[PDB]
Amino acid sequence: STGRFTLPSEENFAEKTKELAELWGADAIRNGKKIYNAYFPTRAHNEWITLHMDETPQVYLLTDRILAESDTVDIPLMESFFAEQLKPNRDADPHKYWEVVDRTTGEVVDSANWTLDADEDTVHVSGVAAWHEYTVSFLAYIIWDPVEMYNHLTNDWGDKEHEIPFDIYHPATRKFVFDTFEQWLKDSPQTDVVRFTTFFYQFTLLFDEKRREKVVDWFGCACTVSPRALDDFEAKYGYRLRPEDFVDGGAYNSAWRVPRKAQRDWIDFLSGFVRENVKQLADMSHAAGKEAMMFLGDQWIGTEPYKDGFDELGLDAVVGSIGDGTTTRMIADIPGVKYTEGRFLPYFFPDTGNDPSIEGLDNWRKARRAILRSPISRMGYGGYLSLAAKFPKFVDTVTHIANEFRDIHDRTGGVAAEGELNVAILNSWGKMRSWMAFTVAHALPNKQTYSYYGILESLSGMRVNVRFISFDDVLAHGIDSDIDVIINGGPVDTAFTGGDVWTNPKLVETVRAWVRGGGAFVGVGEPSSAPRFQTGRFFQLADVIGVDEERYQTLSVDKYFPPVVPDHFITADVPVDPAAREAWEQAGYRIPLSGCGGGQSIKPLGGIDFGEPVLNTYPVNENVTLLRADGGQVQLATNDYGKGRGVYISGLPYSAANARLLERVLFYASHNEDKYAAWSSSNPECEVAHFPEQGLYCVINNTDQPQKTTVTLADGTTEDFDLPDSGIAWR
Amino acid sequence: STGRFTLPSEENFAEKTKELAELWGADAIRNSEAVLALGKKIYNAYFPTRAHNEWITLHMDETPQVYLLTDRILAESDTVDIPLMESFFAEQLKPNRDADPHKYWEVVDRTTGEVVDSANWTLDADEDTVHVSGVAAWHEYTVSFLAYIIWDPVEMYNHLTNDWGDKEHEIPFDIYHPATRKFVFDTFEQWLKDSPQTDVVRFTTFFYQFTLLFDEKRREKVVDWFGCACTVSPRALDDFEAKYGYRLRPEDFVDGGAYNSAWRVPRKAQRDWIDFLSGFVRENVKQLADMSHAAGKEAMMFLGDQWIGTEPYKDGFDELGLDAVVGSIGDGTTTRMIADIPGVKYTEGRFLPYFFPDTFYEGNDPSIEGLDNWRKARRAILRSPISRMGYGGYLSLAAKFPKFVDTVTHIANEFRDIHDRTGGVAAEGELNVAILNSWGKMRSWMAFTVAHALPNKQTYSYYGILESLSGMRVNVRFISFDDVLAHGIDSDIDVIINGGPVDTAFTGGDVWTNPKLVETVRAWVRGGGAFVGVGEPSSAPRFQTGRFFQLADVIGVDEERYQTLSVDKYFPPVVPDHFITADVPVDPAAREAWEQAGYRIPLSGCGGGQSIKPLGGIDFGEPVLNTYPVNENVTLLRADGGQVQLATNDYGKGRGVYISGLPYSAANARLLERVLFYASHNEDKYAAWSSSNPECEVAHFPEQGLYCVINNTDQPQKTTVTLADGTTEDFDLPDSGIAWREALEH
Numbered sequence A: 001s002t003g004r005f006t007l008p009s010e011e012n013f014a015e016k017t018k019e020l021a022e023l024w025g026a027d028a029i030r031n032g033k034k035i036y037n038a039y040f041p042t043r044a045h046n047e048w049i050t051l052h053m054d055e056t057p058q059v060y061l062l063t064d065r066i067l068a069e070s071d072t073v074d075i076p077l078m079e080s081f082f083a084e085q086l087k088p089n090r091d092a093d094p095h096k097y098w099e100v101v102d103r104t105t106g107e108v109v110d111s112a113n114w115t116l117d118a119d120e121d122t123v124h125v126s127g128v129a130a131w132h133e134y135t136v137s138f139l140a141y142i143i144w145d146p147v148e149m150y151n152h153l154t155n156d157w158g159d160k161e162h163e164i165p166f167d168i169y170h171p172a173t174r175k176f177v178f179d180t181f182e183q184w185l186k187d188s189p190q191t192d193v194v195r196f197t198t199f200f201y202q203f204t205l206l207f208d209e210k211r212r213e214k215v216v217d218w219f220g221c222a223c224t225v226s227p228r229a230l231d232d233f234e235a236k237y238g239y240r241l242r243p244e245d246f247v248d249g250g251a252y253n254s255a256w257r258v259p260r261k262a263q264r265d266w267i268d269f270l271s272g273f274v275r276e277n278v279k280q281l282a283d284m285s286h287a288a289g290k291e292a293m294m295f296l297g298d299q300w301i302g303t304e305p306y307k308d309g310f311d312e313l314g315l316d317a318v319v320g321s322i323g324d325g326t327t328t329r330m331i332a333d334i335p336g337v338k339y340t341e342g343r344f345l346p347y348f349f350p351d352t353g354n355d356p357s358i359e360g361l362d363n364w365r366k367a368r369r370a371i372l373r374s375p376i377s378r379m380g381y382g383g384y385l386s387l388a389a390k391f392p393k394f395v396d397t398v399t400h401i402a403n404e405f406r407d408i409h410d411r412t413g414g415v416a417a418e419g420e421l422n423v424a425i426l427n428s429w430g431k432m433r434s435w436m437a438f439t440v441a442h443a444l445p446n447k448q449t450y451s452y453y454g455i456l457e458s459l460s461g462m463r464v465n466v467r468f469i470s471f472d473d474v475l476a477h478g479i480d481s482d483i484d485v486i487i488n489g490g491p492v493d494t495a496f497t498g499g500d501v502w503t504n505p506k507l508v509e510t511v512r513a514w515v516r517g518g519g520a521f522v523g524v525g526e527p528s529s530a531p532r533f534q535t536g537r538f539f540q541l542a543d544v545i546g547v548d549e550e551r552y553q554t555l556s557v558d559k560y561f562p563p564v565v566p567d568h569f570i571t572a573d574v575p576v577d578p579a580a581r582e583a584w585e586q587a588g589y590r591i592p593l594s595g596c597g598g599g600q601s602i603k604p605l606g607g608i609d610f611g612e613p614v615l616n617t618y619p620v621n622e623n624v625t626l627l628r629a630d631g632g633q634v635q636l637a638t639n640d641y642g643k644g645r646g647v648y649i650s651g652l653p654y655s656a657a658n659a660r661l662l663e664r665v666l667f668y669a670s671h672n673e674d675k676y677a678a679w680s681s682s683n684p685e686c687e688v689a690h691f692p693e694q695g696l697y698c699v700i701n702n703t704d705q706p707q708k709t710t711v712t713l714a715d716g717t718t719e720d721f722d723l724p725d726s727g728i729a730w731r
Numbered sequence B: 001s002t003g004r005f006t007l008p009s010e011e012n013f014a015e016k017t018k019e020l021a022e023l024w025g026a027d028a029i030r031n032s033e034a035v036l037a038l039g040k041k042i043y044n045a046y047f048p049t050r051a052h053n054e055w056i057t058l059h060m061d062e063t064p065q066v067y068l069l070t071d072r073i074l075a076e077s078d079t080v081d082i083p084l085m086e087s088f089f090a091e092q093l094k095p096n097r098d099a100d101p102h103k104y105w106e107v108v109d110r111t112t113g114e115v116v117d118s119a120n121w122t123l124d125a126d127e128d129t130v131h132v133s134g135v136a137a138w139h140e141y142t143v144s145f146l147a148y149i150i151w152d153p154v155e156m157y158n159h160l161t162n163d164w165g166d167k168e169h170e171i172p173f174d175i176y177h178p179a180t181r182k183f184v185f186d187t188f189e190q191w192l193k194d195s196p197q198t199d200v201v202r203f204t205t206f207f208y209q210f211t212l213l214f215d216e217k218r219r220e221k222v223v224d225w226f227g228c229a230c231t232v233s234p235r236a237l238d239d240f241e242a243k244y245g246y247r248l249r250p251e252d253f254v255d256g257g258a259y260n261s262a263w264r265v266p267r268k269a270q271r272d273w274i275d276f277l278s279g280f281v282r283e284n285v286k287q288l289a290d291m292s293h294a295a296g297k298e299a300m301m302f303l304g305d306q307w308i309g310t311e312p313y314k315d316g317f318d319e320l321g322l323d324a325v326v327g328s329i330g331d332g333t334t335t336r337m338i339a340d341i342p343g344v345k346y347t348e349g350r351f352l353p354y355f356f357p358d359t360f361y362e363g364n365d366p367s368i369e370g371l372d373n374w375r376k377a378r379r380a381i382l383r384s385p386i387s388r389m390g391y392g393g394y395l396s397l398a399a400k401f402p403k404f405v406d407t408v409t410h411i412a413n414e415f416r417d418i419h420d421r422t423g424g425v426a427a428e429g430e431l432n433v434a435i436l437n438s439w440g441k442m443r444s445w446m447a448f449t450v451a452h453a454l455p456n457k458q459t460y461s462y463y464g465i466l467e468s469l470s471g472m473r474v475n476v477r478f479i480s481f482d483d484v485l486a487h488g489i490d491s492d493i494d495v496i497i498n499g500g501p502v503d504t505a506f507t508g509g510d511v512w513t514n515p516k517l518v519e520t521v522r523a524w525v526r527g528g529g530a531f532v533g534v535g536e537p538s539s540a541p542r543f544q545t546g547r548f549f550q551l552a553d554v555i556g557v558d559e560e561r562y563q564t565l566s567v568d569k570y571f572p573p574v575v576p577d578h579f580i581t582a583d584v585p586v587d588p589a590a591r592e593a594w595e596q597a598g599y600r601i602p603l604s605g606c607g608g609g610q611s612i613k614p615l616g617g618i619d620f621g622e623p624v625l626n627t628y629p630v631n632e633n634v635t636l637l638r639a640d641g642g643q644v645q646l647a648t649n650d651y652g653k654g655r656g657v658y659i660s661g662l663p664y665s666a667a668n669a670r671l672l673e674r675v676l677f678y679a680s681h682n683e684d685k686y687a688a689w690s691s692s693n694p695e696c697e698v699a700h701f702p703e704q705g706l707y708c709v710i711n712n713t714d715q716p717q718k719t720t721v722t723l724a725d726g727t728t729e730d731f732d733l734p735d736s737g738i739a740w741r742e743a744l745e746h
Ligand SMILES: CC(=O)N[C@@H]1[C@@H](O)[C@H](O)[C@@H](CO)O[C@@H]1O
Pocket: A147, A150, A151, A296, A297, A298, A321, A442, B604
């Protein structure tokens, strides 16, 4: 049990620093061991940026919609934005760089028809149509670094000076940053690892007039424009971006949107620029005898750790924030670095009286099921070490975790567990957004995302191989012959279902043919959906999965539901209260009634949490197998399709039960039922990792209980376990 | 107290007929001898397009026809075979082989939408199968083909439902064909002479049956009470082309599988077809009426069955000279369908239950349904009187239920008494409310219907708006977008309601991307109008990334469509004490739990201000997911489960209101009524002629110097009625009761 652990520094508590590093087998100290220093290339020099204020990052902002009540309207620029963070750019010619849109028609208002007030941040529009809504899209300087701003507001730093951010796209600021880092390196001989936190462009993070978050996209590049960059883009790509190409009608190019060419063009542009400079920073670091480590977050926009070429940056490490299985996978699967690191929870900060061991062991549980599938090299925590030395139950929690971690490494050699199936998530983005589907705010699923995010989180720690593919991959090269299951999920008209790509007959031909020949297709929520393309067919692959969504176009056609099959391989681990099942059996099915179809269960069978409902799903014919069809619509179904199978699930919030459901779905759909038993846990609360090349397996408790489970080995025999609080057994 | 009441009768029942006719004050008798002596008006049912197999079996290419769409068949190579009849009831439907399939049919690649070249497919000589070649593999294919209708849809329905098992299937006929038309008219002429004792010809109905197709399992496959599917023929299709200057594709009927549902945003081809069919139906209905009148008889049309093409709410209906319309009283809404029809001398309700062994069986109590049906109809009747009432089915069946019999005496007496007191004049409406959709007046009271009187999971959240309004103390009209675009909004309108799911006739679909529509409604609201939006009002997909409900600014709510998830949504605190919710039953245990849990703290990418626990108390039916307030100045009244159900917004002089759904109930009708008075800035007008208790309603008759208060339930209800002058009266109303009082005569 040696090393692989990163411990954060403390102001003066330099006494227990030697004792806790010895107790935890620590080999690195954050901020005779390895030393990490956080570097912040775009802030922490107000002495520079105040003298060149037009070199701050900038962003297109969309004003509120203003109603015109005659042929003129006044549109205030800053009324809905935090004036401490953002300020309208009056230097760059508004009539050149801004755009007033009539949102009612979609037409751009002619620049002869509007002016910027000389003394107020107000736009005067004349010659317009009464009773239309009008917005301005304008450039704004970001005069306060979004993350430092966030920490300021969160910790209430009061009147502490606001860090002004700068943009290395301007040659003067770029020269300053490199000169400074050179000097910094010279002045930092003790530092072993430069922890870049992060680089050049903050992810979209804008605040409103009430000091609240207004707009956030962990992947967003709102905060990446300036007049020079926009003009250079035109010179390089051969057309001019509209402000609309960034404000996106109010959507701000959310990753949920079906990606437009303009967005891809901008990503490529930004990425060439960011990557060359990151490499320069890594080179300088290495030339000084130091390692370069990137933080996966904050100013990470334009790095693209999952695009090809990332390796050529020559970064030594990626370090990332661990909130769960999915966010662990984001870090763990990154190619082209020497090692990876997770900053585990809880952070060492007062708001975590309480038993802090619980969060720490829990954060470790969501992460460890993922680490088993895709190991991370190192672990650690941030913050105030004095604040946690005070909690003796927690210190012992960490000693255990650091040792379990290394024991895992020492048993497995950092090798990943064996995957029993090959699963592909199919969406508009593919590999570049590996493990990043459905995310808005990092680690914060919500009402609108959690029914889909649950898919990734289920997969993150599952005994299968997961890969991320795009509709472009499938159209150019077909479906790789080693894939067992394809998954398509999300709401209609998103990047994650795909939108109008589904009206492209080549795509449909390719998937249909592959499933007919024995492939497996799993649709979640509104899979393969295309609005208005066919009057009687919303899910374009409805025939594959046996389920469509009624969109109020087909109410005249009676829908007939076949009887639900309660005893089935897929649902075999769902406990049902006998009295629930009894009620469901007793009430029976609806009798055909004019205009109402028939066969829908009068009472629900239940037992399963499906998240957000997809209303009026129905079976396409009576040969589709219904597994849950409660409340007059369909939540779970399966269909045979030539040699292959399609499955529908309306939604899938993460839980052990739901992860087991999905796993069973994956083995069933790819006709691999008899392959399921080997290396399985009978208890859904527990999970098995098989390491054949080492002749070993482990079984883990996903919880802080005692859990009883039977593991089935490949040779048919069974081994029983009684697992203590988040335990781990090895055979 | 006698009259306005139609009595069913049968053979060998002269004595009970006589007694019950006397008991109920019946002035008319419906056929199904000695009974003829009584001096009552005599109704006889007539069925123009059936009951004559001896003719039609000799002229089988003159049965009505319909375009049918086969199942989607997957091609797995460059050829594919399509069974025409495997999803259809072969006892009802037969592919039409006589009329050139290559002229009249279409094979469609559903995966591309492309019509398959007529050269690339053949109809098998021996099997009902189409063979197709030169197709793309992995695409889905269908055939749209003409089928003869060989069994009368309604007679069939009844046969299957009543287990008639054995008897001959009645075959329908289509009068578009000159020979069949002549048969029908010669036969009606002969019948009139053979029926001197008949006073009222009760046409059940006319020429074209509403869409009603069955599947290979003898179940209903496709129904639309306003549907035009069963109305085609090669001749008619060809005549249409000549008249309108373009050929209808089979697609113009099958509609991708929708079959032209009234819920579909109407296409020009649909409207042309109606106009075409209606000219022809109306000319021939008129002849029947004229022949009836010349024989000294009245002509009465059943609002149902073969009524397609009569268009009772379209202009000109009065020119048919029909004396009466009769319809099934299923509820308030279906009562209004009948009552509001202009162009006839009188209207008639056929009440429930029907005298049949499915409800008149030992152990059942039909008087409960009988009185229930009366209650539901009576609240609508006060707003729009119908002239007459009656029952159908077997009298000898109802005669065995003395409790039921005594309930009828009560209903008959009450019906007549409401008529005598009000003189058949509508109660005074307190606001003018306009329902706005693609159809307008021609579908007055017909919005949200699929099968008649059968609201379901998909429709009840919107049908509830009509049922609420059907008996409400307001004037209700139905207007179209075309009316609005041509003439603006009539100045007498207080409130406009726009309701339904996105991309339907009822919300309006892309009409909402028409600047002029948006201009007109906005300016009218700003100048003091009221806009009430239900479900997905003013919704237009894709048009604006950041705006789904085009009038979100008016009503203060939009729906998140996963395009705007980077924008945090901030909900202002809910206001539980409001005019609109004033009559909602309080659950202090719900209210205190709600207050206790409080509101979500702003969280990154999750917005904030959403109540952590539901307030509840109101059934809004089907959820509209992820509705949210557009700004923090919108008034949230219900916003449970991280989305919005009920909200109001000030818009200049006027107001908008959002409601996610509205299943009918006393509580919900009262909530709507309150929405209407509030949104029109008419709170001060609300009290006058109102019942404190939502289970009761008030009808005012200024010109008779009367008001009445009615109990809409079978329980006793006490209520306090506020009069115009501010004075009040208390009432203890019995089970289903009515009370009358004097008011100031105007
Ligand atoms: C990995 C990552 O980008 N983390 C950031 C964090 O630095 C920041 O404080 C927060 C603001 O809400 O957003 C994200 O959680």
